[PDB]
């Protein structure tokens, strides 16, 4: 009874305390900054094997491999320089909506309709791809999940939850349950000591991976958030939405930076990334193509559009010498 | 110019035969999507079929294989992942003739046939409707009628009459019948004539789907 | 992981005879399959290769036309036939599995060895010195000279730094020039440019001695160096 009010009253404080907390708005700093300039993307490779769409895709730390995964009950791996296929292993399920790719290269991940993480060992004896671990505990599909370490991973499921889980152990070290909404995206820090993940109730949230307690709060979208991305420094982060609008926010002003939004558009969001230094966001939308916004002028900089189906995934290497796009055509496009 | 690449290439193109091969046998093989409301007679027809928050359920007949997704036992928002089965090739959607009264049932049975047929992604995807516990639905209808589901039915409590009404109510919930076929078959138990229904209806949507290949259509 | 080969005893010359490699252990039918022979007092020598589903086939230029060489993968097993074996094949014969994608580490595991005796352009690989007396704790640093520069035009320098144990198969070491095998101890390194290459040992401890090999892998056929032996 008292407590709503009391949450309200709280709410009240929390966004006047934020307004206390704002003097100029980043168009306002940033209109004496030179423009990047209409930036043209060429297409370098098209990467074709897969037979369904693709609903996932991740790079590799070195910057040459990448794992992507398709409906059609196959994750495969691909030296992007030469579009060979280094890797292909099948699941035991094929309704996958994630994959991820370890930073040490010694594994890959995977999971979907089937509540399971799965975790394949790519680097081992016998010459093929075993299934090194499943991760069960979930409720709801997996969502997301982001290596940690070889030995630590983070999930994110549409049951309202994440959670840290020790690979070597097998079970849930950590459970982060916040949100009210199904959580459809995650991003570490560079760091790997904090990470945001964004829900179906129109938020936000941070969370410190060590203690496993919410940190921080951020609303501003009116529906879904169905993609999240820190920026580089690690000290904010891009979400994008099925209202067709992405925006910036900031971690130690607390709120919303930045909006990125163009009347011309009118579909959701289904994937962001940053640049190497930042200066680019960089887009994926149902429209079929893909938008590069300058992170700081928020205008639309370019247009990556060589895609038959709506763009699912999205990503840019380590050393941001491409920038890889998958989409529901059964093709990825590597751009540079 | 590709020195140990050879062996590399040589390695990707068997391999990529072998995705070749197997999305080959995979595209010979009928997807189903079985739908329903709780406590319906989605369990039911399964056991019809010779034979965690998906279920896979392989069965053969007449030289054709099966695939049926049950996705009921996952909750979730299903607007997030109902898209993952675009190009199922039909929806097995369940309803109970036995809940017309009891709690309404229907009422939730006919607002979610009315949500998944006329989704953005199954536009024309085939809907065969199985109407299960048409034997229990007999003396149902002897003590309580149609009408306490219906407010505006007008006709004798027989199950001739009923059901047809019943089925003809499901029927008339897309918007679209010029582009999709809804197959309604109540469901006996008798020498499993549901598979053969079944079977007739895949058959006929996997003749459209040529048509639609091949140009004709 | 296992590759238990057979077939050897005497063999009356101008005649025929064929070694089965029976494989136990590993996916046989993704792994290429080498065969490599050692001389009664010399170093190794490449015969045959049969790439993953036998679709490319290479063979010495010294064993070209007599010898062939197949595979059954369904039942996981090895064939080189011979006919007209003269008296410079008698030699120990091993099987040798390699696999090639982006980072793998082909030439990895050797079979053990049959014994095979018969009654009575190519890229030269060069090491210079042949036997090197040593102390445990020391380091050494055998060196490897090519007469074509093994770097390629994509930065892979194909090199690959083998050692035989006295009474044991050829175990991998170093393959690129840098990579260190699985299993082996950090204290190999790999080292050097195009036609200059060098293999340092730091604290050496005991029981790896015997001889290095210096095998190319940019053109076939593969050829191994003379092989430098330590002694302590």
């Known amino acids: 009874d008292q407590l709503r009010q009391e949450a309200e009253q709280l709410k009240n404080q929390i966004r006047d305390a934020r307004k206390a907390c704002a003097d100029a708005t980043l168009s306002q700093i940033t209109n004496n900054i030179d423009p990047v300039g209409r930036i043209q993307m060429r297409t370098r490779r098209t990467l074709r094997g897969h037979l369904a769409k693709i609903y996932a895709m991740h790079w590799g730390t070195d910057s040459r491999l990448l794992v992507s995964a398709s409906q059609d009950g196959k994750l495969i791996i691909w030296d992007s320089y030469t579009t060979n296929k280094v890797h292909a292993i099948p699941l035991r399920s094929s309704w996958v909506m994630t994959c991820a790719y370890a930073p040490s290269g010694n594994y890959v991940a995977c999971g979907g309709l089937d509540n399971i993480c799965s975790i394949y060992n790519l680097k081992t004896r016998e010459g093929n791809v075993r299934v090194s671990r499943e991760l069960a505990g979930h409720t709801g599909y997996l969502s997301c999940c982001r290596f940690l370490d070889d030995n630590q991973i983070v999930t994110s499921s549409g049951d309202t939850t994440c959670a840290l889980w020790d690979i070597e152990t097998g079970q849930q070290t950590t459970t982060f349950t916040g949100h009210t909404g199904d959580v459809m995206s995650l991003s570490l820090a560079p760091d790997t000591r904090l990470f945001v993940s964004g829900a179906c109730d129109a938020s936000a949230k941070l969370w410190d991976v060590r203690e496993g307690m919410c940190r921080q709060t951020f609303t501003g979208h009116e529906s879904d958030i169905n993609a999240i991305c820190f920026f580089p420094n690690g000290n904010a982060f891009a979400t994008g939405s099925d209202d067709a609008t992405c925006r910036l926010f900031d971690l130690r002003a607390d709120q919303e930076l930045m909006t990125y939004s163009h009347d011309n558009i009118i579909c959701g969001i289904t994937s962001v990334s940053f640049s190497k230094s930042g200066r680019l966001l960089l887009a994926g939308y149902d429209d079929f193509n893909c938008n590069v916004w300058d992170a700081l002028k928020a205008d639309r900089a370019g247009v990556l559009a060589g895609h038959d189906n709506r763009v699912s995934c999205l990503g840019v290497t380590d050393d941001g010498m491409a920038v890889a796009t998958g989409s529901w055509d059964s093709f990825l496009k590597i751009w540079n | 110019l590709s020195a140990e690449d050879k062996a590399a290439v040589e390695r990707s193109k068997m391999i990529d035969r072998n995705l070749r091969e197997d999305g080959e046998k995979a595209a010979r093989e009928v997807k189903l999507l079985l739908l329903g409301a709780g406590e319906s007679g989605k369990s039911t027809i399964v056991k019809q079929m010779k034979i965690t928050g998906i279920v896979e359920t392989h069965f053969t007949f007449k030289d054709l294989h099966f695939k049926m997704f049950d996705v009921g036992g996952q909750r979730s928002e299903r607007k997030k992942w109902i898209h993952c089965f675009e190009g199922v090739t039909a929806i097995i959607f369940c309803v109970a003739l036995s809940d017309y009264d009891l709690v309404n049932r229907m009422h939730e049975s006919m607002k979610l046939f009315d949500s998944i047929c006329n989704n953005k992604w199954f536009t024309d995807t085939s809907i065969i409707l199985f109407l299960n516990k048409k034997d229990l639905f007999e003396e149902k209808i002897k003590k309580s009628p149609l009408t306490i589901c219906y407010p505006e039915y007008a006709g004798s409590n027989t199950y001739e009459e009923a059901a047809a009404y019943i089925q003809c109510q499901f029927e008339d919930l897309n918007k679209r019948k010029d582009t999709k076929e809804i197959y309604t078959h109540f469901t006996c138990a008798t020498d499993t004539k549901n598979v053969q229904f079944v079977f007739d209806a895949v058959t006929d949507v996997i003749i459209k789907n040529n048509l639609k290949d091949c140009g004709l259509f | 992981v296992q590759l238990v080969e057979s077939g050897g005893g005497l063999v009356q010359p101008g005649g025929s005879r064929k070694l089965s490699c029976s494989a136990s252990?590993?996916?046989?039918?993704?792994?290429?399959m080498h065969w490599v022979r050692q001389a009664p007092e010399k170093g190794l020598e490449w015969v045959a290769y049969?790439?993953?589903?036998?679709?490319?086939?290479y063979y010495a230029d010294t064993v070209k036309g007599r010898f062939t060489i197949s595979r059954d993968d369904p039942k996981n097993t090895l064939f080189l036939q011979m006919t007209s074996l003269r008296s410079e094949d008698t030699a120990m014969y091993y099987c040798?599995?390699?696999?090639?994608?982006?980072?793998?580490?082909?030439?990895?595991?050797w079979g053990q060895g049959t014994t095979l005796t018969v009654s009575s352009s190519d890229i030269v690989m060069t090491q210079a010195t042949s036997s090197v007396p040593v102390t445990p704790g020391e380091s050494v640093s055998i060196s490897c000279r090519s007469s074509?520069?093994?770097?390629?035009?994509?930065?892979?320098?194909?090199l690959y730094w083998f050692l035989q144990r006295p009474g044991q198969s050829p175990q991998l070491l170093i393959y690129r020039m840098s990579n260190l095998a699985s299993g082996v101890p950090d204290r190999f390194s790999g080292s050097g440019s195009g036609t200059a290459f060098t293999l340092t040992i730091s604290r050496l401890e005991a029981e790896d001695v015997g001889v290095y090999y210096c095998?190319?892998?940019?053109?076939?056929?593969?050829?191994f160096g003379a092989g430098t032996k330590l002694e302590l």
């Open positions: 074509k520069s093994l770097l390629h035009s994509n930065g892979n320098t194909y």
């Open positions: 049969i790439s993953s589903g036998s679709g490319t086939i």
């Open positions: 252990g590993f996916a046989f039918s993704s792994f290429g």
């Open positions: 040798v599995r390699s696999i090639y994608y982006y980072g793998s580490s082909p030439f990895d595991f």
């Open positions: 095998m190319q892998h940019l053109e076939y056929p593969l050829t």
